[PDB]
Amino acid sequence: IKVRENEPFDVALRRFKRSCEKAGVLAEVRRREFYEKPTTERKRAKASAVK
Amino acid sequence: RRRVIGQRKILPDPKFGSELLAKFVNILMVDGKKSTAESIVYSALETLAQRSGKSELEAFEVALENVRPTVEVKSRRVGGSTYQVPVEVRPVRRNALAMRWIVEAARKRGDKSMALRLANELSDAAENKGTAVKKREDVHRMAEANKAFA
Amino acid sequence: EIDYKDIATLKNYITESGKIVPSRITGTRAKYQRQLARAIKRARYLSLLPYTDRH
Amino acid sequence: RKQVSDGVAHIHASFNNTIVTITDRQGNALGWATAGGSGFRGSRKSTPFAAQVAAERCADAVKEYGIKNLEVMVKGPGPGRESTIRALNAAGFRITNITDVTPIPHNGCRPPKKRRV
RNA sequence: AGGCGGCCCCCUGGACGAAGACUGACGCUCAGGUGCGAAAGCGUGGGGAGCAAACAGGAUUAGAUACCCUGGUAGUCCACGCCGUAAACGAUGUCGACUUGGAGGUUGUGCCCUUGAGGCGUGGCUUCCGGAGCUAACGCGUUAAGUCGACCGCCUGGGGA
RNA sequence: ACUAUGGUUUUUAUU
RNA sequence: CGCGGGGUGGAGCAGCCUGGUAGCUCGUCGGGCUCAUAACCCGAAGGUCGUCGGUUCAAAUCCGGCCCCCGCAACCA
């Protein structure tokens, strides 16, 4: 269940800039990626946000 | 686009003592004739006291409270945007709109003698029937019948 | 080669929601992961483990 | 009519709608509402507010039957499955328990997503 | 090749490995001839929940015999038969010797009575980049479109077809 | 991604 | 030659084991609002409760006449 922590939240998270409500989305393809741009986060996987 | 102009303000005028009395050289002023509007400042409020005399602490307590704005409406285009988006107005509008946003009869059949007119508009904003009712009270039902998005 | 009648270690490879821990988070290679999945399907038919988290 | 003051709420949520039924624990219905029958069509019934109007509309069917403290039975994948309950609490109701009772078919019929193109 | 995934049992092919043994050049290539079918079609007999060629009704539009949308038969699966055709596509016919490197998976086999999601030598499977070479250009690059050999089935500008 | 929709314009000096 | 359900702004229909609220709503007419038409949303115009009685200040809600409608040669001797 949800977060297993104290208090009933469970609140929305954003992990990307210019992506949500306005100016989005997916400014990371064709081809981009990029391996260096998020520094150490790209050394573990290429999928993290939806898988 | 990128315009960020500094906001206009008015100072209380020492002849009338308040900021609420300092705008009647602009509210109901026409053709740039500013001293022609000065001709009837604050004596129009003594003429309002000829129709309901209750002193200056009660002179606007319903003649603005009954008519002041509370919501801003219209849509915002984000897909399927065939609805309206109501938002509550900021305190910088608490004394505004109600003496400017309607001229539907004043420019069509006049609005009676000019030196008696602000004493009529401050009495009509406390009578609240016929003219200027629909443009005010429509947003007290629109914001309850079209509120499913924001 | 991996048993389905014992669950005392097999329990490590599944969540409280019944999902199997993904192949690149187990890091155990295919011969283990495929035999662990067979053991989970059998331990579920043998009533030692539940299926999904629905009443 | 006399107040009965007990019951179970049966909630169903889809990608575009939210459905509510109130029953006595004998299994017997006393009121219904949907986010569509709340006076909304198109995707206007998909809103988090149409899920609130459905809760207040089903509460309008039991207002003389006096039910305010109940337990919930939840079906279906739709995001309204919590938006109707967080609103039901703000409408003056007491919630005791929430149980997800969604079934799990062993296939049978092909999933309605199709496409197949 | 097409294709192959609920689970259990009866009958059992294909692939691959280690050591010991055997035949006796039996080795490579291939229209018709002999077998093998995805899906639908089809004779005979069943079955009908879901979905849906056909068929309507309601909408969309200038129009809508189509899209949308509510329904709906055949078809789906199964038993015995017929139908050899598909992007059956990693579009590259089959067999064979050989040429720099860097890396990701699958699986035999001997040994240690083993920090392990082990490991090494050797066999098989299956893959990504890229050097030299090859190409009009994409791209191919040891499972090469390289070096080309031994053969086979096709081809000869387009309209018509 | 962020509303489900909107068809026609004679061959023609000719660069 | 005789019966009882219905009759409520132009149509359809509730109102009725409390006797007064004129109602649900379709159409008609006019505005907000989306790309745009309709949906949506804000509103407007028009009722001799068939038609007269009983009991009454009072009857859509109960009754009785008179009339029309109703599956139907009401009987035509």
From Swiss-Prot, chain A:
Keywords: Ribonucleoprotein, Ribosomal protein, RNA-binding, rRNA-binding. Residues 43-51 have a biased composition (Basic residues). GO terms for molecular function: rRNA binding; structural constituent of ribosome. GO terms for biological process: cytoplasmic translation; ribosomal small subunit assembly. GO terms for cellular component: cytoplasm; cytosol; cytosolic small ribosomal subunit. It comes from the Bacteria. Signal peptide: none annotated. Part of the 30S ribosomal subunit. In stalled ribosomes contacts ribosome rescue factor SmrB. Probbly involved in recognition of ribosome rescue factor SmrB in stalled/collided disomes; fusion of protein fragments to its N-terminus decreases ribosome rescue in the presence of SmrB. Belongs to the bacterial ribosomal protein bS21 family. This is Small ribosomal subunit protein bS21. It comes from Escherichia coli (strain K12). The chain holds residues 4 to 54 of 71 of the full protein.
UniProtKB/Swiss-Prot annotation, chain B:
GO terms for cellular component: cytoplasm; cytosol; cytosolic small ribosomal subunit; membrane; ribosome. GO terms for biological process: cytoplasmic translation; negative regulation of translation; ribosomal small subunit assembly; translation. It comes from the Bacteria. The keyword Amino-acid biosynthesis does not apply. Keywords: Ribonucleoprotein, Ribosomal protein, RNA-binding, rRNA-binding, tRNA-binding. The keyword Ribonucleoprotein applies. One of its GO terms (molecular function) is tRNA binding. One of the primary rRNA binding proteins, it binds directly to 16S rRNA where it nucleates assembly of the head domain of the 30S subunit. Is located at the subunit interface close to the decoding center, where it has been shown to contact mRNA. Has been shown to contact tRNA in both the P and E sites; it probably blocks exit of the E site tRNA. Part of the 30S ribosomal subunit. Contacts proteins S9 and S11. Cross-links to IF3 and the P and E site tRNAs. The strain K12 sequence is shown. Belongs to the universal ribosomal protein uS7 family. This is Small ribosomal subunit protein uS7.
UniProtKB/Swiss-Prot annotation, chain C:
One of its GO terms (molecular function) is small ribosomal subunit rRNA binding. Keywords: Acetylation, Ribonucleoprotein, Ribosomal protein, RNA-binding, rRNA-binding. GO terms for cellular component: cytoplasm; cytosol; cytosolic small ribosomal subunit. GO terms for biological process: cytoplasmic translation; translation. Binds as a heterodimer with protein bS6 to the central domain of the 16S rRNA, where it helps stabilize the platform of the 30S subunit. Belongs to the bacterial ribosomal protein bS18 family. Part of the 30S ribosomal subunit. Forms a tight heterodimer with protein bS6. This is Small ribosomal subunit protein bS18. It comes from Escherichia coli (strain K12). The chain holds residues 20 to 74 of 75 of the full protein.
From Swiss-Prot, chain D:
One of its GO terms (cellular component) is cytoplasm. SUPFAM superfamilies: Translational machinery components (SSF53137). It holds the Pfam family Ribosomal_S11. GO terms for molecular function: small ribosomal subunit rRNA binding; structural constituent of ribosome. Keywords: Methylation, Ribonucleoprotein, Ribosomal protein, RNA-binding, rRNA-binding. InterPro entries: Ribosomal_uS11, Ribosomal_uS11_bac-type, Ribosomal_uS11_CS, Ribosomal_uS11_sf. GO terms for biological process: cytoplasmic translation; translation. It comes from the Bacteria. The keyword Lyase does not apply. PANTHER family: 40S RIBOSOMAL PROTEIN S14/30S RIBOSOMAL PROTEIN S11 (PTHR11759). Located on the platform of the 30S subunit, it bridges several disparate RNA helices of the 16S rRNA. Forms part of the Shine-Dalgarno cleft in the 70S ribosome. Part of the 30S ribosomal subunit. Interacts with proteins uS7 and bS18. Cross-links to IF-3. In stalled ribosomes contacts ribosome rescue factor SmrB. Belongs to the universal ribosomal protein uS11 family. Has been predicted to contact the N-terminal domain of IF-3 based on footprint studies; exactly how IF-3 interacts with the 30S subunit is controversial. HAMAP family: Ribosomal_uS11 (MF_01310). This is Small ribosomal subunit protein uS11. It comes from Escherichia coli (strain K12). The lineage of its organism: Bacteria, Pseudomonadati, Pseudomonadota, Gammaproteobacteria, Enterobacterales.
